[PDB]
Amino acid sequence: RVTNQLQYLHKVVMKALWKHQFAWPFRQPVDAVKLGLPDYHKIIKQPMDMGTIKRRLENNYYWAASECMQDFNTMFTNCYIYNKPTDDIVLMAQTLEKIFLQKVASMPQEEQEL
Amino acid sequence: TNQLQYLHKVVMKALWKHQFAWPFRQPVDAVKLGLPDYHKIIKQPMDMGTIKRRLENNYYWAASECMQDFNTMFTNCYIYNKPTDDIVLMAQTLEKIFLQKVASMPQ
Amino acid sequence: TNQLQYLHKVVMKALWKHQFAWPFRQPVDAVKLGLPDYHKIIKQPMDMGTIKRRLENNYYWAASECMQDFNTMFTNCYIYNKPTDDIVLMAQTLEKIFLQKVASMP
Ligand SMILES: Cc1cc2n3c(c[nH]c(=O)c13)CN(C(=O)c1cccc3ccccc13)c1ccc(CS(C)(=O)=O)cc1-2
Ligand SMILES: Cc1cc2n3c(c[nH]c(=O)c13)CN(C(=O)c1cccc3ccccc13)c1ccc(CS(C)(=O)=O)cc1-2
């Protein structure tokens, strides 16, 4: 579907996050072989990344804005769960997530299809 | 504000009474709970009791500030605990409700 | 250009960052937004991204051209959308700020 809320998430939230200087670890699925993370998929059962979210927005995959919001949330939460508290990637995720939440605070309130 | 009243009377009210909310209704007492590393790892403790009181005392200026406090509380949980701990699943469940209700926050 | 300077550094700066600006920051994409009739109804599309680029490149010959582009943008929204769409309220809010700022232009 195409809704006011999903348009906002695409044109405002994803636009802001995708071009952020900390976005690059998150723009594609984690490649556990490339990154040397042999237990990644034992710990993280629902991988998510902003490339996948962006494609779903582009392809009208989502039915409700909350579904997109949950994908963003899963992506951040995966990072906090998997990594050590002191890893810089945690700081990068926190930074992006704060922007996510700041932008979501102004999202259109009542979702209706376009 | 309209938004802060929604976060207080709609979002928090729903999370507060949830069956998974009880670990989050007051600050983590690391001594009582036997977590001597908790405050070495978690530098910004947050909980729903603290957020609720801040909502009651007009502490916030904007809804986003309150949303960030919710966010910190959940994130602390994912950062501090082992992936396999039940408390992680409890936080996830609550955070999904938080985001669902936030989606419908008025403008 | 003092007027165009004002339109760029005061009017566009306020409107561009307003929380209601996001539907107007780029051209309407009738394909991606699924609106087969948009260009049958709206003959002169306009948006704040185009206006902003024109101010930056010294495109306009007079302030009135820039103001008319703002006006066209808002009018397209009112003509195309249903009266109850939130976007109509968003355009009304932005246009009132536009006119308020225009009254104090050199
Ligand atoms: C979600 C995610 C992304 C990455 N993740 C890693 C561990 N866990 C994760 O969740 C994770 C391992 N990883 C890092 O730790 C790392 C991060 C950021 C800056 C760095 C600077 C120096 C060294 C490492 C890093 C890197 C390295 C590079 C790429 C980009 S790409 C095109 O190659 O895939 C992605 C990740
Ligand atoms: C955010 C938070 C809250 C608690 N946390 C714990 C570890 N890390 C955390 O982040 C955390 C340690 N903790 C437990 O491990 C625990 C054991 C047995 C059953 C459980 C069921 C659900 C959740 C936790 C447990 C308990 C125990 C009790 C209370 C409530 S109270 C008034 O008595 O202090 C809070 C926590």
Curated annotation (Swiss-Prot), chain C:
Residues noted as binding a protein in the record, renumbered to the chain: 37, 80-82, 85-86
* Start and end residues of each Bromo domain: 1-105
- Report the outcome of residue 78 to K: Loss of homodimerization
Location in the cell reads:
Nucleus; Chromosome
Q: What is the effect of changing residue 38 to A?
A: Abolished binding to histone H4 acetylated at 'Lys-12' (H4K12ac)
Q: What quaternary structure, including any partners, is listed in this protein's UniProt entry?
A: Homodimer. Interacts with E2F1. Interacts with (acetylated) STAT3; promoting STAT3 recruitment to chromatin. Interacts with CTCF; promoting BRD2 recruitment to chromatin. (Microbial infection) Interacts with herpes virus 8 protein LANA1.
Q: What else is known?
A: Some specific inhibitors of BRD2 that prevent binding to acetylated histone are promising therapeutic molecules for the treatment of cancers or inflammatory diseases. ABBV-744, a small molecule, has been tested on tumors with success: ABBV-744 antiproliferative activity is mainly restricted to cell lines of acute myeloid leukaemia and prostate cancer and is able to displace BRD4 from chromatin. GSK046 (iBET-BD2), which specifically inhibits the second bromo domain, is a promising therapeutic small molecule for the treatment of inflammatory and autoimmune diseases.
Domain annotation text? The first bromo domain specifically recognizes histone H4 acetylated at 'Lys-12' (H4K12ac). It also specifically binds histone H4 acetyl-methylated at 'Lys-5' and 'Lys-12' (H4K5acme and H4K12acme, respectively). The second bromo domain recognizes and binds histone H4 acetylated at 'Lys-5' and 'Lys-12' (H4K5ac and H4K12ac, respectively).
* Similarity field: Belongs to the BET family.
Question: What does the UniProt function comment say about this protein?
Answer: Chromatin reader protein that specifically recognizes and binds histone H4 acetylated at 'Lys-5' and 'Lys-12' (H4K5ac and H4K12ac, respectively), thereby controlling gene expression and remodeling chromatin structures. Recruits transcription factors and coactivators to target gene sites, and activates RNA polymerase II machinery for transcriptional elongation.
Q: What is this protein called?
A: Bromodomain-containing protein 2
Q: Which organism is it from?
A: Homo sapiens
